[PDB]
Write a structure and sequence with these properties.
Helix content of chain B: 40-55%
Entry title: Mycoplasma pneumoniae small ribosomal subunit in chloramphenicol-treated cells
Bound molecules: magnesium ion, zinc ion
Structural class of chain B: mainly alpha
Number of helices of chain C: 1
Organism of A: Mycoplasmoides pneumoniae M129
Keywords: In situ, Ribosome, Chloramphenicol, cryo-ET, translation
Order of helices and strands of chain C: HEEE
Helix content of chain C: 10-25%
Distance between the termini of chain B: 70 Å
Oligomer: part of a larger assembly
Number of strands of chain B: 0
Structural class of chain C: alpha+beta
Order of helices and strands of chain B: HHHHH
PDB class: translation
Number of helices of chain B: 5
Largest interface: B-C, 12 and 11 residues
Chains: A mainly alpha (60), B mainly alpha (123), C alpha+beta (86), D mainly alpha (155)
Chain A: 30S ribosomal protein S14 type Z
Number of domains of chain C: 1
Largest sheet of chain C: 3 strands, mixed
Distance between the termini of chain C: 45 Å
RNA sequence: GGCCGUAACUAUAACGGUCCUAAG
RNA sequence: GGUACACGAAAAACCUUACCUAGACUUGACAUCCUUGGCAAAAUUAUGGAAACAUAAUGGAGGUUAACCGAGUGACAGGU
RNA sequence: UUGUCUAGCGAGACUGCUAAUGCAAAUUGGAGGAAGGAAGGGAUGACGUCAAAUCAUCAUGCCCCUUAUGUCUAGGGCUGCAAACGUGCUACAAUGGCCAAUACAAACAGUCGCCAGCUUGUAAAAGUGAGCAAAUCUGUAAAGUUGGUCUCAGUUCGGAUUGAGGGCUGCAAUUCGUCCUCAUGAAGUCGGAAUCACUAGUAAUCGCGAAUCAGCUAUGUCGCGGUGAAUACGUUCUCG
RNA sequence: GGUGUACAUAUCUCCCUGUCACGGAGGGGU
RNA sequence: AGCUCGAGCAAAUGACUCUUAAUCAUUGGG
């Protein structure tokens, strides 16, 4: 069960606290970056592909 | 001393001697001290009957230390005679609140009764 | 714990059912799933069937059980005896 | 299997009595990284030494550390069963370090009141060759003298 | 000289534990 | 095992949730391909309701069907 | 308190000069220098081993279900409990407990938010209500200093557990949130055989911030600064 | 005492080791 | 009970593993 959960997440619930943030590219529920709306394992791929502007590897 | 059946230490200050009573804690003892105006930092042995009667009167106004134990006992019996899940959990000597009981919570289960764990001959 | 200005809580479907069954003389068990509802004074005298998770356990409220939560008088998991591992 | 000898940081002279050993024992009684607290402990103990012995605190401290300061060390070397010990002459720096470490360890165990008085009385007792660090030094010295035979073989 | 346990059909015990004696 | 055990999980009261009990559904909650019309979907208010869902309401942005709202329809969708 | 600070560019350190010895790479010492001989830290991780981990991020061969292993909802569960182990927090205390006054950071974050001030309340917080789309406004720094008190006790240590009254988030806090107040006051007085981390701003210790988040006994994770040690003789032994 | 006479063996827990045995620490049973 | 005296073996079902053995539980069987 993933397609139904994705569709239900897009659909608005009847309570405000019912709403949770899923990844927009994949459907992963846990470990989602609200700054980018993308889970960690897809954020890594996008950053390595250069899709997210300004996200360079950090050396500190 | 002179406060009911409790004998507070004579060589300790008043605001801790009051804590030595069962129904009186530390903050409430300070509250009684301030309300009665008696200055703390005064050793109980170096205290007089005028303060000893007023402190007793204010303590009597507050909840008696003797009746508190029977109040708690009555409340637990009340909670058990309802059939509440909280009462049942309190009955079988287990953590009443949402405390975990998997690997912890020995303060309510006493000493450990070690048993023989599973024999592992490999699989 | 629960706030004062908010007060108590009932789903109000249970409240409507309780009012109706109190006005009706020949009361029967009220099958409810709302374990979140607190036992209001008007609840007194009725009998409820609360969903423990599997079945509906019957609880008869009294003038004393007033205040607690309705599902608090029914359990959800059962444990009675371990078995020796070895 | 290191073939490198470690460097050594400066000891720093004490800014009151101009004696490096004072700074060393401050760092030894250091706990939780509290230089101020350690310095207060040391200077209060030295003032108590003033109040009691009526002599110079630095001289009393030197008389204590020189007397507690050991000569031989027994190094454990196991071959087949148990360990046979080996007496070796220690360098002066490690000698002083061991003296200070023993002084602090036996000072933080005495039955008395605040650690100020604890360490002060430990120092005044070690100034007269009667103390617990004295007993420790005596024990290691006697053990080395007993195991004097295996001194030739070290490794 | 005894007693007890022990091998992947059963059976037995190559083997292990222990008491006593001057030695079994 | 080292290289699992404050690890996946950078947040389990509902949701999450993939488990159990129960109430409901069947080209389906979601999508394409085809014959076909768009003069809807929402949201909210009533009654039944544990809520799913049912019977009635304002019948709705829009743009004439663009997206979507449908009927028919078998390939199929769907599976943590 | 006038040249901090912030961020673009650039200079600077190159065994560059010198002495020793070596054929030469090069090694050691000295000078000047902020920095000396990979100046400190990070990113950067070869062929391959363990048929190592992930079909539960995602994709996918093959098999299996197709009015059900697919879908919606309510309730329960993932939080159980004679036990065992791992990782952490808090302690067993005068280098301390409590109270009062008080000095000094960096980084980061913020318009369903950060919330200054004021009023109310023993307090969590409530109401009013400016300021800030931010080097401007907000997010109380604590250890530390001084003073008062306790005077070595299972205590003014230790906070578990337990009862009651309240606050906030949320449809909803019983299973199963956390905070405050009041009350109670388990064990524990340095921990057996045996083990872990660490070579300087490191260990130890004290606070601050952020991510996911309506809310969360995260004491977890990722970061920032304050104080700030001890030791390295050597490879005989121990693991790789 | 579960077995031979409180003891030993045996049993349980924790260390040890890749694992087991051996070994080490602790507990209980007439 | 299939065998030795409800117990232990035997048999089966699953867990376990690349698959077994062993192990772990469950279990019918008079
Ligand atoms: Mg999928
Ligand atoms: Mg959520
Ligand atoms: Mg909890
Ligand atoms: Mg334990
Ligand atoms: Mg759930
Ligand atoms: Mg229209
Ligand atoms: Mg048309
Ligand atoms: Mg490189
Ligand atoms: Mg494998
Ligand atoms: Mg692995
Ligand atoms: Mg699949
Ligand atoms: Mg549900
Ligand atoms: Mg879990
Ligand atoms: Mg003090
Ligand atoms: Mg300004
Ligand atoms: Mg303020
Ligand atoms: Mg002070
Ligand atoms: Mg005790
Ligand atoms: Mg305390
Ligand atoms: Mg609760
Ligand atoms: Mg003590
Ligand atoms: Mg190193
Ligand atoms: Mg498998
Ligand atoms: Zn993703």
């Amino acid at each position: 069960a993933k397609k139904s959960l994705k569709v239900k997440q897009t659909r608005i619930p009847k309570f405000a606290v019912r709403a949770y943030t899923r990844c927009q590219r994949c459907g992963r529920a846990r470990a989602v970056l609200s700054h980018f709306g993308v889970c960690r394992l897809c954020f890594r791929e996008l950053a390595y592909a250069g899709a997210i502007p300004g996200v360079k590897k950090a050396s500190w | 001393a002179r406060i009911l059946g409790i004998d507070i230490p004579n060589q300790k200050r008043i605001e801790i001697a009051l804590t030595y009573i069962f129904g009186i804690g530390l903050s409430r003892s300070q509250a009684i001290l301030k309300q009665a105006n008696i200055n703390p930092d005064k050793r109980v042995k170096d205290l007089t009957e005028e303060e000893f009667v007023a402190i007793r009167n204010v303590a009597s106004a507050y909840k008696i230390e003797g009746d508190l134990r029977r109040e708690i006992a009555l409340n637990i019996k009340h909670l058990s005679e309802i059939g509440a899940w909280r009462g049942l959990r309190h009955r079988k000597n287990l953590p009443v609140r949402g405390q975990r009981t998997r690997t912890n919570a020995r303060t309510r289960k006493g000493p450990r009764k070690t048993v023989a764990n599973k024999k592992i001959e490999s699989k | 714990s629960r706030s004062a200005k908010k007060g108590a809580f009932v789903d109000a479907h249970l409240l409507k059912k309780v009012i109706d069954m109190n006005k009706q003389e020949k009361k029967r068990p009220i099958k409810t799933w709302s374990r979140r509802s607190t036992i209001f004074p008007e609840f007194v005298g009725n009998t409820f069937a609360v969903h423990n998770g599997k079945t509906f356990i019957n609880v008869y409220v009294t003038d004393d059980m007033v205040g607690h939560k309705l599902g608090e008088f029914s359990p959800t998991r059962n444990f009675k005896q371990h078995t020796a591992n070895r | 299997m290191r073939k490198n000898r470690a460097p050594k940081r400066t000891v720093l002279p004490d800014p009151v009595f101009n004696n490096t050993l004072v700074t060393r024992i401050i760092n030894v009684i250091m706990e939780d990284g509290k230089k101020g607290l350690a310095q207060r402990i040391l200077y209060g103990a030295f003032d108590l030494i003033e109040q009691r012995t009526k002599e110079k605190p630095l001289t009393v401290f030197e008389r204590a550390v020189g007397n507690v300061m050991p000569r031989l060390e027994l190094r454990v070397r196991r071959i087949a069963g148990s360990n046979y010990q080996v007496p070796t002459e220690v360098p002066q720096d490690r000698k002083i370090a061991l003296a200070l470490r023993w002084i602090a360890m036996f000072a933080r165990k005495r039955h008395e009141k605040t650690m100020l008085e604890k360490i002060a009385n430990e120092i005044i007792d070690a100034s007269n060759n009667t103390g617990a660090a004295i007993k420790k030094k005596d024990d290691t010295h006697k053990m080395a003298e007993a195991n004097k035979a295996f001194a030739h073989m070290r490794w």
